[PDB]
Every structure is written in C-alpha cells, then in structure tokens.
C-alpha cells in the first residue's frame, strides 16, 4: 500500500514563565521514529524506533543541528506574529508547522505538504503544485510575499519530491520487518441489553496496523448509519491500534444486523453477525 513521512513542530509562548517550549516529532505512516523536546535532558534529536538506530553519528548531528535551528525560528516567529496581529506581550500563543510527503504502492511520489498554523487556525500553506502559497488572511500576505521573494517554494519542492521520498524509502527498507507489516484486526462482537426493548451490538477491531480501517453496519445488507456510534481509532500503546462501532437494535432483531471490516491486512473484507 501507500506510505507517508511527516514531521510535526509545536512552540508555545508563555510570557513571564520563561522562553517558549518546542516539541518536534517525526513519523513514517503511524509509527513515531524521532523526537526532540527543547526542555529534555539530551538536547539531541532522539530515536523512537529500532530501525532509525541504524543511522550513524553524522545523521544524529545533522538532525540535531536542523531541529535546534527550527526551534529558534519558531521563537522568532512567535515575536513576528504578535506584531503582525497587534497583540499584547501578555498572552500565550501557539505556532505549528507540518511537512512531508506521500508515496503510492510503487513507492513513487504522490504529494507533498508544507503548512503553518497560528493559534489553532491556518496561517499559510504550500499548494499541491508545490509552486505557490495559500495565505489564510490579510496578515499572512506579508509572509507570502517574503517567501515568494526568497524562492522558498522551489527549495521545498526539491526536498519534497527528492530527499523526502528517498529517505522514506530508506526507512521502509531498513525497518521492513515492522514498517512493512500488516497486522490484520482481531475481531469479535458483543451484546448488551439496554432494556427489555433494545440491545447494543458492538463490533470490535483490535491489534491492527496500520491505523487505517473501516467498520460499517448493515441491516438486511443495506448500509446503516442511524442509531450507530463509531469511536475514533485509538493507539493501544504497543504499536497497534483499536476501534469499535456500535448499533442500537430492537430486541428480537439482532440477526438482521452485520458488521463489515476493511483493512489492508485482510485478503477479503470480513462480515460479523451476532
């Protein structure tokens, strides 16, 4: 199937409570592989998956240099943005940046991303063509012009279509045993009586990887969403994920209902009945 590499960077100002705290995390698909926390002991980019420990010292030195520089740009940005929006020096604010690339089943480039948020809303984003910018508001036009004049988009395009894709491939190879695994969901259904009048059917999916999954209810083989509840896919803590979907049914009618499970670890979609 398809794969992605993504980096996520967050800084929060807290005036009167020191300088901003910065956190960076890197993922391949749903697996975290590096972290940096500006207040942690090491002051280095740190490994979070076994296969990244294959990288030598030049890598750790370079990734540390880059992530520390990024922490400092986020610090400068918090100041700049307070100015742009005419804000007090008293409030706490948040900057976020995400970037990375997607590849398909052939491991070739599908798309790249590079985008920024201020205080929980869009600020500026690279468009899909990797040549132009979407400014979210009037203030962001100033940054758009700055980045257009400095030819940032061209530099980002080269990374996203080149380095990003190559390093994602390298990681997939180096961590094949785990990253290229597909753990099919362990599935079952439970039944609980709401009263004499209705019961809840709950369809479980456990121990699966990657996180992408679809759970759907049908009644008489017809798609049903009314009287259903679907929880957000959640991490188990061991590298795998969990999800459930439930439907409330009239007593005596449980057999009309089926749960349908789609996951890449499955040769064919599964159907469950009570």
């Amino acid at each position: 199937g398809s794969h992605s590499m993504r980096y996520f960077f967050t800084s929060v100002s807290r005036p009167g409570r020191g300088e901003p705290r910065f956190i960076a995390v890197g993922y391949v698909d749903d697996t975290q592989f590096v972290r940096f926390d500006s207040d942690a002991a090491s002051q280095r980019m740190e490994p979070r998956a076994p296969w990244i420990e294959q990288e030598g010292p030049e890598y750790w030195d370079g990734e540390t240099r880059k992530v520390k520089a990024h922490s400092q740009t986020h610090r400068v940005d918090l100041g700049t943005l307070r100015g742009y929006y005419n804000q007090s020096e008293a409030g706490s604010h948040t900057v976020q940046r995400m970037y990375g690339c997607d590849v398909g089943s052939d491991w070739r480039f599908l798309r790249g991303y590079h985008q920024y948020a201020y205080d929980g809303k869009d600020y500026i984003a690279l468009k899909e063509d990797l040549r132009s910018w979407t400014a979210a508001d009037m203030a962001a036009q100033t940054t758009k012009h700055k980045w257009e004049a400095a030819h940032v988009a061209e530099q980002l395009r080269a990374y996203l279509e080149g380095t990003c894709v190559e390093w994602l491939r390298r990681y997939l190879e180096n961590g094949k045993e785990t990253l290229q695994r597909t753990d099919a969901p362990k599935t079952h259904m439970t039944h609980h009586a709401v009263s004499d009048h209705e019961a809840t059917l709950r369809c479980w999916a456990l121990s699966f990887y990657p996180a992408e999954i679809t759970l759907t209810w049908q009644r008489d083989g017809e798609d049903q969403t009314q009287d259903t509840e679907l929880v957000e896919t959640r991490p188990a803590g061991d590298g795998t994920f969990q999800k459930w979907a439930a439907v409330v049914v009239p007593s005596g009618q449980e057999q009309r209902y089926t749960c349908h499970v789609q996951h890449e670890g499955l040769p064919k979609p599964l159907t469950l009945r009570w």
């Binding site: 980096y7 890197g26 890598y59 880059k66 700049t80 940054t143 400095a150 940032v152 980002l156």
Partner: peptide, 9 residues
C-alpha cells in the same frame, strides 16, 4: 530526514 532550510514568517 528533515528539510535543510531555515525559514521565518
């Protein structure tokens, strides 16, 4: 691997 550029808003 991170991008090798520094940018400020």
């Amino acid at each position: 691997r991170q991008a090798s550029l520094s940018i400020s808003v």
